[PDB]
Symmetry: D2
Subunit: 324 residues, 4 copies
Amino acid sequence: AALKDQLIHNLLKEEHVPQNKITVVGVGAVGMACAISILMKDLADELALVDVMEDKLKGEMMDLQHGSLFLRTPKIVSGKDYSVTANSKLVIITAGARLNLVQRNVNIFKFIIPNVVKYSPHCKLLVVSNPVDILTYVAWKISGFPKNRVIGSGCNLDSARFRYLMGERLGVHALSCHGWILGEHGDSSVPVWSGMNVAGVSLKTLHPELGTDADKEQWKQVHKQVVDSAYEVIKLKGYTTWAIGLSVADLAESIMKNLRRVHPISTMLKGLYGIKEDVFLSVPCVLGQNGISDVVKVTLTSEEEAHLKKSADTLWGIQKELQF
Amino acid sequence: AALKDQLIHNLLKEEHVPQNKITVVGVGAVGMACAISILMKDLADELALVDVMEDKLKGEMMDLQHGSLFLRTPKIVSGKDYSVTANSKLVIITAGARLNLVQRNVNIFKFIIPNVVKYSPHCKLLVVSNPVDILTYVAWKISGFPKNRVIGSGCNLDSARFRYLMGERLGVHALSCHGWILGEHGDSSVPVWSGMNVAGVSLKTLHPELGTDADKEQWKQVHKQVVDSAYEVIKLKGYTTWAIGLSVADLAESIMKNLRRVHPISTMLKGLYGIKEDVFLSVPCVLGQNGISDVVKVTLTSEEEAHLKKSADTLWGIQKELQF
Amino acid sequence: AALKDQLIHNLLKEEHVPQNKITVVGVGAVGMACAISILMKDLADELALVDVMEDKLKGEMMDLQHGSLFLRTPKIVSGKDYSVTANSKLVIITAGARQQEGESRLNLVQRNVNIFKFIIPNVVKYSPHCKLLVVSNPVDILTYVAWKISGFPKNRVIGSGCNLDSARFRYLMGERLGVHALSCHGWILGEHGDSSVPVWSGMNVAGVSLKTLHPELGTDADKEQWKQVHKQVVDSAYEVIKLKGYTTWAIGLSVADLAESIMKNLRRVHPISTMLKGLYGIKEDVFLSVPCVLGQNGISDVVKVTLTSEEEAHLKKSADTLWGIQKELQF
Amino acid sequence: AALKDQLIHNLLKEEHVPQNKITVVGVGAVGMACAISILMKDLADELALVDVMEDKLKGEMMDLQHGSLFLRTPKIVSGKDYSVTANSKLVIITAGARGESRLNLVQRNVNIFKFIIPNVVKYSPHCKLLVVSNPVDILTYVAWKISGFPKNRVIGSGCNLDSARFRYLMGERLGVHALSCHGWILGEHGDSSVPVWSGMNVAGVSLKTLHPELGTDADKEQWKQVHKQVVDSAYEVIKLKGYTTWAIGLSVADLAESIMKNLRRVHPISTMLKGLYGIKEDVFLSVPCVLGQNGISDVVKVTLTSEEEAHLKKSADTLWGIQKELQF
Ligand SMILES: COc1cc(OC[C@@H](O)CO)c(Cl)cc1NC(=O)CSc1ccc(C(=O)O)cn1
Ligand SMILES: COc1cc(OC[C@@H](O)CO)c(Cl)cc1NC(=O)CSc1ccc(C(=O)O)cn1
Ligand SMILES: COc1cc(OC[C@@H](O)CO)c(Cl)cc1NC(=O)CSc1ccc(C(=O)O)cn1
Ligand SMILES: COc1cc(OC[C@@H](O)CO)c(Cl)cc1NC(=O)CSc1ccc(C(=O)O)cn1
Ligand SMILES: O=C(O)COc1cc(F)cc(-c2ccc(C(=O)O)cn2)c1
Ligand SMILES: O=C(O)COc1cc(F)cc(-c2ccc(C(=O)O)cn2)c1
Ligand SMILES: O=C(O)COc1cc(F)cc(-c2ccc(C(=O)O)cn2)c1
Ligand SMILES: O=C(O)COc1cc(F)cc(-c2ccc(C(=O)O)cn2)c1
């Protein structure tokens, strides 16, 4: 008998139905950052990687597999064919193109998403690709999924950056500094000044000029620096990876473990915040095993409200063009 | 409008079903150490506690809950009624009560086990109650489950104890010391001297008298000291908890994450190792999401085999005297 | 040639000095819950246990040791003698007398002061630089006492104070709101226990003020009766003692979280008890829970929560009461 | 007046000394992988990165810093000046240069260490050194010679990742996790490394005793090939993605855990082994070593066949022959 049979007696005809499987689409800098953050956080019993770059894809798979001894995620698989992603609980989209673009990313999602829904009919979708609020909308429409099951990473990372930057000025950990960046991801995002606090102590109430032009401490520049920081880090090393990857794994955690934590992520919010279009904006969302199930209604100033509505009309205008 | 409804908009009206539920039956010292160990290892998304001591049950529950902020297991339930354990992946039995002290344990299982299988038809059963090999046989009979899905902790703790003590003699961590205690849990367990090693260096080869009465270094007393340690700790503190708890949680980790790691636990080994009876003995077991799917076939000495054979017959002898 | 020397060739003569050593004083329910939580969060490379009950002490030690294979804390030691705790970064005190029939609560405290008068000088002698974390009740008072006896700067003597009650408050809070305690924010401050102060104006989710949304929040006229949530917090230890005879798992996790902020110099803000004479309008040498930045040097700063008049008044009254009991004490 | 001062009362002055600081030298693919692995296993309360590429360096530090909310390592710093590395308990070296010749390549790496290692030592006199740059067996020796450190404190990752690769492939053939499969690759890193066939087991069951052909060319199941697969898998991945990262960073992180927590686990790492295993020259080879807060404290003496010992001897000759020709 073969050596395996000499050592090991098989007692069961083993059906491999993956139970907490997660797929990352795209093995770029971001895709792999998510992959390794997830692997180090023990969130999956199986991980799949999909891409059209097959050698790259095979390498990253092998390189990951080689650290199995050190991980608690027993199976890693890769392939250009989406059968490898079958039965995923969560599929994270990092795929994108390298003029105005979005229609091509739309074209890319036109192939990818249906392939995804085909092999994981019941999965949650987490889109990280930029422009994130648009592509999330695109993935949502192509997928046929209810809105709770299609999430955009939105302002999650920028909120983490803002809390980090807050912690540097205040001299305490980002975990203890609370602050929310909502709305359209990127340059038009909203620093919700009224919500910034340590230990329940409002900063805007302590210091009413917070975030204004007359602000002697120039806290408005804190938001400014978060909106830039991506570009600035790309200027330095060529892309960003580690921080985005860590922020996505944080989201996978709440999803996989049904935590019902609140995160600033992009959800389809028609019917809320005065919004009347089918668009995705970042609002504090309760995140759990069913995707986004609830959303916190934040009290905004009247211009904060007009600002949100402007983003909705912006994204929609851009959406009105695109074709699926 | 309730304050909750002012704060949160409900975007989804969803239902229940836990994806990685674990139940602990019995909230005495061992069951609870299993829970806290499981809760601190993030193995579950829901934990059920069940017992017949209703106050104790409720108190232990609320106490765990008060620690949510520090845990990543969002739902903890308890109750005397077994519906609370519905849809568990794994159910850990620590319930128990002359030598009809077994029969009374049998009558307990007669109540608990059918209740367990009613609410979680597809669960893996993990029996810890002593005498563990017999009690795992009993839940197997009562449950109706296939053998791969009924597991006794058997010799898993005693092997870890063995490996700890080994690392004391050698001055390295237990993680690095290898050695197996197999077969019948308790005084008649088998220290497989030939398997003991560090980094693949056979101890019994460097030192042929290993384990013998002639052994100047008396390594036999090491196994005796493992077999007595429960009695010694009970002698000092009244019972053991923490080590058995950590040991059960490590089993739960193989199951919940489908690690296919090899552990010394008690399995229904009829047809292997020369055994022809319906009995459970600890042998090195491949453990995953389907319970025990494979068994390592350890090369035993004729003296080691006859010793396992004798354990089979005394176990079957005890089981015959039970009323079901 | 011994089997060890046949297998293992020694190259270094080891003089073992622990780098991240934690000591837990007291191997009762609370002490061991602290111990196991700390063991499983990998916060120390050496753990030591002391008590006066020697069999119990040895039993717990061996039990934890037999779990070594599943842990990453390589050395666990115990003994009645405090040399076993030498060179600790953190020493956690859970020792106390249990009441009698019988004795007034003042005389029970005094007996505890008699316990601390033996323990703290032993602790300080063998880990001169440690941080002290006092868990024993009444915690504000016994932390002041540990402060006085040790002769440590205040930054290095911490009371667990309202740390657990705030976590409880957040949990009860997330049960009402359908959100995980992690995302719910609210602080219990001041004196541990009945006289603790639920700071209504800071409660929030996502930085949204509950108080602003619901101006009745935590008033007598409040129709949703949120005050009762505070009462639930205040009573929850009692309620749990009625059910199971003591509490452990919760207090243990909450201590280990404090331990993690210390061992890892995180400077997270926790609701813990500190010497705040001179702050928050307090004129006396007392410990009260306020939000403290917690790190490798203990408590380095405290957040100045804006309190209402009545809330300042509850703290100052709590300050008078503690100072009053503190005077009646024999050191 | 200021907002911070309004919100926060300061009670303690700064005496800020890192207690568990790790420095990673080099922020290439391997350095960063080590860094994120160390960051996600919470082994340090301060991380420091150093390199000569100043932009890339500041950029990498910054990306890690933006993830702080999701980490429990409160301070991350970087710069071209080794003063940022001071009071490291652990210092991981991944620096290096890429017809040149083995020898001329080695010498330029030696020239980098002549600048780097003395800077590491000036600032962390008591640190452990852990070299990863290839050829590691040689560059760990250069690190030891230059640093003036006692051998217990200079460690080369050596065959650690390869042993792990070997247990992974073992596991695939056997249908069990790599954690439950045991095998040891020792000797000189790379293709001259020795797969110790007689140690390979599961549950203490010796595979070679079951399958006596194991290792040899008389083997129908060609188990000898698994070691070739390991030896080759590095460049197979480089062939496919340009380099490797995730696996080496994970392996290094596991080593750092043993050191930082003083675990005294046994790892296959490269250590100065003149005197043991029959080696006469000043040479670093991978042997099982017990690894703790003072570096390598003990070595497990494996029982080697006559041929296996011959291999280690020949490696030691090749290594020394090279070092003998280097300019320090
Ligand atoms: C360029 O198209 C892609 C980029 C991706 O991510 C790149 C990078 O982020 C990760 O390596 C990934 Cl995963 C997949 C694809 N492509 C596809 O599915 C096939 S369909 C498709 C549709 C339009 C286009 C195009 O206009 O360039 C290309 N491919
Ligand atoms: C004594 O009977 C029990 C002990 C248990 O665990 C004890 C301890 O380990 C945890 O507190 C648990 Cl969970 C449940 C039960 N009992 C039952 O379900 C009902 S059936 C039953 C049958 C015979 C007996 C008896 O002879 O004492 C008692 N109960
Ligand atoms: C009874 O006094 C103690 C209780 C303890 O903890 C019990 C429990 O909280 C955890 O097991 C611990 Cl650790 C130590 C001690 N005792 C001592 O150091 C010696 S000094 C002392 C002073 C007054 C008293 C007394 O009034 O009973 C007893 N001992
Ligand atoms: C090429 O020289 C280096 C490479 C490094 O890592 C590269 C890669 O692993 C990560 O980007 C790092 Cl950290 C540092 C250096 N260089 C130095 O200290 C200064 S000394 C020096 C001496 C000779 C040479 C040379 O041969 O070109 C280069 N540098
Ligand atoms: O990784 C690849 O393969 C293509 O590039 C991507 C893909 C993606 F899915 C998100 C980002 C992304 C998103 C946010 C930020 C930033 O905020 O720093 C930076 N990058 C970049
Ligand atoms: O704690 C309860 O509620 C009842 O008692 C039990 C229940 C159980 F399920 C396992 C053990 C058990 C098993 C092994 C050892 C020992 O080996 O230290 C000690 N105790 C004890
Ligand atoms: O367990 C022993 O050894 C003696 O009792 C103690 C010791 C201690 F150090 C803290 C508490 C304590 C503190 C808080 C709460 C509560 O809030 O549930 C309950 N108990 C109880
Ligand atoms: O990444 C850089 O910054 C420069 O290149 C290095 C540096 C280093 F320190 C180790 C390796 C290395 C070592 C072994 C293997 C392999 O075995 O997969 C792959 N790479 C490569």
